Design a protein around this ligand. Sequence first.
Ligand SMILES: O=C(O)C1=C(C(=O)Nc2sc3c(c2-c2nc(C4CC4)no2)CCCC3)COCC1
Length: 134
Amino acid sequence: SHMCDAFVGTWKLVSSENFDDYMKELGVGFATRKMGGMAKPNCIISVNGDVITIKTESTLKNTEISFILGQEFDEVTADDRKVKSTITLDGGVLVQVQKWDGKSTTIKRKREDDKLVVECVMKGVTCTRVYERA
Ligand SMILES: O=C(O)C1=C(C(=O)Nc2sc3c(c2-c2nc(C4CC4)no2)CCCC3)COCC1
């Protein structure tokens, strides 16, 4: 268990593996995959009381979520899915599930040495994205 404070910061994407495959497995099209593949977002994580905010800022598109751990929320994803999301803290890992149309995907954010490591799973595809502090 890392606590929410190990996460707070401004993080820049430095590596990504299998992200096009992850988007493809979700059904995303060529145009959105084209914007996402070489994007290098900044992820800005902040807290105030029970509310955590995660901003994902990129040249071609910005998105943001705010949530309370364990409380489901509606989310419009970068690829325009309308999902129901729940985020919890398990062993220091922020575990997000998105549910829509009988499907689910998991985004797990963990602190590992100097890295914010983001594991994105859809079916048999596993993508790993690594951020470092700006
Ligand atoms: O924060 C992260 O690293 C994570 C994601 C992310 O950064 N996605 C980003 S940045 C960005 C785009 C997309 C994008 N994602 C998706 C679907 C895969 C969901 N389609 O487009 C498109 C517009 C340009 C900027 C995705 O989910 C998990 C973890």
